[PDB]
Amino acid sequence: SMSVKKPKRDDSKDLALCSMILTEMETHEDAWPFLLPVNLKLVPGYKKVIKKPMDFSTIREKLSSGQYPNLETFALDVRLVFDNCETFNEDDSDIGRAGHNMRKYFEKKWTDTFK
To answer: Could you say which architecture CATH assigns to the domain 1-115?
Structure first.
């Protein structure tokens, strides 16, 4: 509260570490559904159904331009990618499986780096 602060957790490396994680996600073989924004002119249903589209290129641009105020807003956008994928894709499709695999991969790197 006012003039009463918990000890300072060191956040000075968070930007670099989120960039490393994101590089690992970009180079994973199963990243291909997530590298670029879904083409809203060519994919029926996507625009109406998925209220907040998100992809790795868009997270990379946001990261590079100071549009994440802290590491939690970065993790929210990563998880949005996989939440969107589960909304739109059957679990037993190639893209559906890709999304589960990538979510697992991310969450391990996240825990190992920060927790």
So the answer is: Up-down Bundle (1.20)
